[PDB]
């Protein structure tokens, strides 16, 4: 089974590393400098955007050394100290990036389902969350700080910057740290991001559906008022208009001015209905037609922002899953190969061939991520 696998697959690897380096580096420079221009006086999402683009900026800043690493075919020539600092720094920027993306999914979830959270105490909370995110990321990168070292490989005739696990239990430590990367670097962020997407999709879609429901009941009840001259009919139709106007009030962005004005006019028209004046209430219903027909413009604003926000959440989820999925799949079944489950030689060879491309796929997530979040 054991043969020398095709090693001519890593010829274009440093070229891709440099392409991702220049593209993602320039993009993150544009975003970070834009935050250095507009600043954003005491905001929540802008801070997370800035720190995220900073983590990605440091990651792509460390990309060129690994491009040189793949250029010399796994030969590290910079020393053990640089292997420690730049390896653990790369992992640190990765974990900080993913954790910041998850935290942004949480902040958007709270900002959508609970529009109550609109205080300036939230930035002061971020003044503790950001150091907490960096703290959890460092404590997550400690295994990449204690084992990442330079070791000599004689069969390859190459000094490689590897994870120097104890050779007695090397496979167990490898599969264990790999499982730590799978759970801490994808599973939990996929649970949080996924549940956030299901929440925003549920609340958003049901919200818009209820909005159309109420609106159509409004037009139906007004058309009923216009062609019905009875005692206990205009009152009930006005009651339906008030109830459906109160249930459709829940539309937080102007809007509250229109909905509240409508509720007030329906209320006064109901006051005229409770006295017996029907004609004046019908003229007031014509004025209601003037208000609602003069206020359909923003009703489309709600729909447009519905579509845009939906495509934004779906774009974030699909981006994260598509990008960081193959790396953690190959890391998972690779960890299965470490513990003896997968002993097929050519399969493990395929793993070792496809892992670097997946690493560049996660780095591609760090590249396009500011393009998706900032723009």
């Amino acid at each position: 089974c054991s043969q020398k696998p095709s090693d001519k697959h890593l010829d274009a690897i440093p070229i891709l590393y440099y392409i991702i380096f220049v593209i993602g580096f320039l993009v993150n420079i544009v975003v970070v400098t834009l935050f250095c221009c507009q600043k954003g006086p005491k905001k929540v999402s802008s801070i997370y955007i800035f720190n995220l683009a900073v983590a990605d900026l440091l990651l792509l800043a460390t990309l060129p050394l690994w491009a040189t690493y793949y250029s010399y075919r796994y030969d590290w020539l910079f020393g053990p100290v640089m292997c420690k600092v730049f390896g653990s720094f790369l992992t640190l920027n990765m974990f900080a990036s993913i954790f910041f993306i998850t935290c942004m999914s949480v902040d958007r979830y709270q900002s959508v389902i609970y529009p109550f959270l609109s205080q300036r105490r939230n930035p002061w909370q971020a003044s503790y969350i950001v150091p907490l995110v960096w703290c959890m990321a460092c404590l997550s990168s400690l295994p990449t700080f204690y084992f990442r070292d330079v070791r000599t490989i004689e069969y390859l005739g190459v000094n490689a910057c590897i994870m120097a696990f104890p050779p007695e239990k090397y496979a167990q430590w490898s599969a264990g740290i790999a499982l730590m990367k799978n759970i801490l670097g994808f599973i939990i962020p996929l649970i949080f991001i996924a549940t956030c997407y299901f929440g925003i999709r549920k609340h958003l879609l049901k919200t818009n559906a209820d909005l159309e429901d109420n609106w159509e009941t409004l037009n139906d009840n007004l058309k009923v008022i216009e062609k019905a001259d009875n005692a206990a009919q205009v009152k009930d139709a006005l009651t339906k208009m008030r109830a459906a106007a109160l249930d459709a009030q829940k539309a937080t962005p102007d809007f509250r001015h229109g909905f509240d004005i409508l509720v007030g006019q329906i209320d006064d028209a109901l006051k005229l209905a409770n006295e017996g004046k029907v004609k004046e209430a019908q003229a007031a219903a014509e004025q209601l037609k003037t208000t609602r027909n003069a206020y359909i413009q923003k009703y489309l604003k709600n729909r447009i922002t519905r579509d845009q926000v939906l495509k934004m959440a779906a774009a974030v989820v699909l981006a994260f899953i598509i990008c960081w999925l193959p790396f953690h799949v190959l890391t998972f079944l690779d960890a299965l190969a470490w513990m003896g489950v997968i002993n097929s030689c050519e399969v493990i060879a395929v793993i070792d061939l496809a892992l670097p491309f997946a690493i560049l796929l996660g780095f591609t997530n760090s590249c396009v991520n500011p393009f998706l979040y900032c723009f």
Partner: antibody
Amino acid sequence: DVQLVESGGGLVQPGGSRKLSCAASGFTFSGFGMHWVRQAPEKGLEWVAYISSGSSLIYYADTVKGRFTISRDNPKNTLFLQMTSLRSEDTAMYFCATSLYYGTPWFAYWGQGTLVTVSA
Amino acid sequence: DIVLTQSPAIMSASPGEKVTMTCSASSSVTYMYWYQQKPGSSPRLLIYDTSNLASGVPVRFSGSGSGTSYSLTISRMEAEDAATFYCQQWSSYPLTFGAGTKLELKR
């Protein structure tokens, strides 16, 4: 088509020095380790030295260790072997050979070889 | 530092015969390699990693062995095979060759 061309051989008086060159063409030179392997007249092969692709790992044979110095020039795709304190036992045909595979310790591509005769 | 001893040193073979040469090591060896060299030319790689055939080498050539005993075998002797064969071990640097085995064509 891999081409390795040695140069710099000749007649050297004992105690002198020499500089053997190995021009490489047909592949990416800055990726694979290189070996120096000599062969004495009417005798067999003898591994001399090995250098990595980034010059981070160097191995010398006990016979030439402390005297020979293997160096590398990736921007010019050239291998170098500086032979100091030459002796009659160093008279041989010097080849530069690699494996075209990370730097493994086998020789799948040999050069033409250059003759070094050490005598007064 | 591992000493390699090839036997026999000089052997002959007619076309259409099985040829086998041994390479014994002092210490244990991880991987064994086999090279062919004709007079007036450079060596070429026959066997890498003890028992793997190199590219362009006929299927007649096969390598075997483990521990401190290895061997090269030409299943069917050809007139183009008559040359000198070396074994080179790797278990830890430095690298060492054998003295060689001169395979002449029986006549």
